[PDB]
Amino acid sequence: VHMTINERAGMSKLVADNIIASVIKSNWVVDILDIEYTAEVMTPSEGYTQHVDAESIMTAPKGKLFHLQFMDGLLRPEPSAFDPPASGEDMRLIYPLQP
Amino acid sequence: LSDDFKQISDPKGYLTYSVKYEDQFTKKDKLRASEADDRIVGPTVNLFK
Amino acid sequence: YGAAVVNIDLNRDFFDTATGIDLTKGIPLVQDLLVPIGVTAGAEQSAEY
Amino acid sequence: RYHESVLEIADIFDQADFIQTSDAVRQLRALMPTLSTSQIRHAIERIAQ
Amino acid sequence: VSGLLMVLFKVMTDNRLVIVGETTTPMSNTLSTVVNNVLRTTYHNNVGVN
Hints:
- The first copy, chain A, is α+β, with helices and mostly antiparallel strands.
- In chain A, 17% of the residues lie in helices and 8% in strands.
- Chain A has helices at residues 13-25, 54-57; strands at 37-40, 66-69.
- Chain A has a two-stranded parallel sheet with strand order 1-2.
- In chain A, strand 1, helix 2 and strand 2 form a beta-alpha-beta unit.
- The B-E interface holds B 4-11, 13-14, 16-17, 33-37, 39-44, 47 and E 7, 11, 15-22, 24, 26-27, 30-32, 35, 38-39, 43-50.
């Protein structure tokens, strides 16, 4: 499903959690048009000074400005040839809807 | 020339809703939404919890 | 060398706090212009933009 | 099958003296909340202070 | 019966005259649209229940 969410307000917590669970276990894509946010664009060395739970994005007040951070991972040098293999997967949920 | 009118401000109706909850299914915790939308919608969503 | 990003921002030194603007989050943000009446506006309002 | 769009008054009037603004201010009014007169007075008083 | 009478009496003598009380005017963006369609500019803080 590509579930658009025009209005977050009145969404049940069991339902917000259920949608996010569907995002993971069933690969839903979930646009949430009600969010207004400012985006700081962090460089790879400064990492992610801020961290956000899915619960907060599904339950921010409708007028408040969220402050998302996004990596510009372009300035990130190749791994040493002998570094141990990364078994597990880096995973990512949140994306911008426009540039 | 006359005290014709008591001047109340946030008037009380002659009728109100009154609710009996089934305590087993009722959640004791107060419901919460956006703060403004709770300011309006809130007394209602609590009365008909 | 090594500049990861070069942005073009509003000059914070010019659009100072004296004008009531805060440019720290990348948009101008002014504290008490467009506001709800009868209630405190709350932090990080989008109208502040 | 209409295409709704802004149209600058400069485009229809040749009389340049009587035109000051542009599409811009309309575009900025679009970002603004519907404004109660009391809110407007507030905004003005804020800009004043 | 007498109960009804007093109720009737208490209605016949409700000389109450409303003055506007405390009333918030919410910024429109902070309201869910279903509330916005319901809201008319401003409202009493004692919203009451409907």
